Write a protein that binds this ligand. Structure first.
Ligand code: CAC
Ligand code: CAC
Ligand code: ZN
Ligand code: ZN
Ligand code: ZN
Ligand code: ZN
Lengths: 330, 329
């Protein structure tokens, strides 16, 4: 229709504006923020940092972010709603499952997972009445049996509600190809789907092929370059040796192939992280001081210097997310 | 000290009475009860089932249960408080980690885990002000490197606060021997430690040796048995095919060996479970309609028929848990 669900309620599509389609307020685990807030210093501290971060993104032109933190990424929608009001930035919340599902999720059938996702979309998250506006899923190269169940549950929940699906992929392993095959076996329209972390490869033919089938290509790891850390056993597996300009030029390459309409760009940033090593957040902030403002402050100007016109950069950052997020059954 | 943290606040040891030492209101995962309460019908239905079940247990003489649900078993201490108050049964809450820690736990140092356990003990669980009176940990046969971190954190937390440590084990793999060695390397007295699920084995030499070192022995799976349900694979992989009377006779055994002061007895029951197959709660309730009342309604009289004196049984169900739960530094 004409309305997108956010943590503050429904908004009309024209209100979304410049939208970052793959972000996080906090990368954690289910129940963790509540049970151990001092891991982040304090809940208040984490919130205040996130509010400053969003206001900084807002002053760079960002109007909406999509928080693709799932249940098992320890999504706290109450936190999302708080920081959204204070920063005057729309936040779309996610259902789905990422890569750390607990036992109570891992043992569920595709039918039960479908019910969980649908409840979070149609009824609300926890007892908050806040509804998800996107379904997030994740696979590791060769899709596992449980992951296949997740993707099919996501497909079915999308098909009943018209909300889009967005994925975590290992692009180096061409992971989107198995994701796409599963989605298509369920009769899901590719234009409901973003294949994420896609800038983690130099294989353009892989990307272009997905695009040509109608998938959105999520180029969301541009500031995850991490230059110089090939000794750090934490910042050499996580992140690599590909410059942000190298990644960003994939955006240009896809535009030149005629697939500007299939491109989504983001940062995959956050303001706290507990799912990795202690103080990884300091590592990330040191390497990307712009945080969520990296896309509008660096990547957009870079693309302009490379001769990408304003109307195209507007289509990618405003029109493309809008079309993606608006619930549609085609 | 002679006071124990419960979910309704501190009680004196005298108040605990008949204490079921290894139980669960709900077996789940972190965040799960609050994200998907309809899995249990509703949160309300779950609380009311648990109030009914505890009330029957209270009728049968139980005054206190120990809920050894950790963070990663989806312990919702607000649920525990509600059902405790409504059934007027004491509940002691747990910190620690079970076998399903998430990345945010799995990636933590022993120093960090120590601080988390201390927080739930000294400050409170989440923002509730409810403090754990016990530390629950779990290993699987061979202790994993992360599981070793958890047990050392548990020991350090215990030595700082005096609260006891209860464990989950595979008695088939004599899991308690590995746990004990880790605990003792940290300087922890065995009198601060219960080795649980010890009734899954019939190896008395394993039990008595542990007992002789001063460890508490948790014979807590007594009502678990999938006899007549052998063609249901999920039932006999979770409950086994050993009679409850056989499990119970292990209690007599340790008494006869002179070890009554080391026995703790329980049902390891619960009123909802999401951390196993769907509708498994109905299979459990089918096997044991008595729920947490199985121990005082069936087991305790069974032991008296086999000639065990009343005072010894009272020492096991009252005195031993009191001594165990009392913060002893
Ligand atoms: C929260 As992530 C680093 O798996 O996109
Ligand atoms: C939570 As259990 C059934 O492993 O004691
Ligand atoms: Zn991801
Ligand atoms: Zn992400
Ligand atoms: Zn157990
Ligand atoms: Zn248990």
């Amino acid at each position: 229709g004409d309305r997108i669900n956010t943590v503050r309620g429904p908004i009309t599509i024209s209100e979304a504006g410049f939208t970052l389609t793959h972000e996080h307020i906090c990368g954690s685990s289910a129940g963790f923020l509540r049970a151990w807030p001092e891991f982040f210093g304090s809940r208040k501290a984490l919130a205040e940092k996130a509010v400053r971060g969003l206001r900084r993104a807002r002053a760079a032109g960002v109007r909406t972010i999509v928080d693709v933190s799932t249940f098992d990424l320890g999504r706290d929608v109450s936190l999302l709603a708080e920081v959204s009001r204070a920063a005057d930035v729309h936040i779309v919340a996610a259902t789905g499952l990422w890569l750390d599902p607990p036992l109570s999720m891992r043992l569920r059938s595709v039918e039960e997972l479908t019910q969980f996702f649908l409840r979070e979309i149609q009824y609300g998250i926890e007892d908050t009445g806040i509804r998800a506006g996107i379904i997030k899923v994740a696979t590791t190269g060769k899709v596992t049996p449980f992951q296949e169940l997740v993707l099919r549950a996501a497909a079915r929940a999308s098909l009943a509600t018209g909300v889009p699906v967005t994925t975590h992929t290992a692009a180096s392993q061409r992971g989107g190809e198995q994701q796409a095959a599963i989605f298509e076996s369920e009769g899901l329209s590719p234009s409901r789907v973003c294949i994420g972390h896609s800038d983690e490869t130099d294989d353009l033919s892989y990307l272009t092929a997905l695009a040509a089938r109608g998938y959105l290509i999520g180029l969301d790891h541009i500031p995850h370059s991490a230059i110089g850390l090939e000794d750090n056993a934490s910042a050499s597996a996580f992140m690599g040796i590909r410059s942000w300009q190298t990644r960003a030029l994939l955006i240009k390459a896809l535009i030149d192939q005629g697939y500007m309409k299939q491109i989504l760009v983001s940062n995959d940033w956050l303001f706290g992280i507990s799912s990795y090593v202690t103080n990884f957040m300091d590592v990330m902030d040191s390497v990307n001081p712009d945080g969520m403002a990296f896309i509008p402050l660096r990547v957009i100007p870079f693309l302009r210097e490379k001769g990408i016109p304003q109307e195209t950069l507007a289509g990618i950052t405003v029109t493309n997310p809008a079309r993606f997020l608006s619930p549609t059954l085609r």
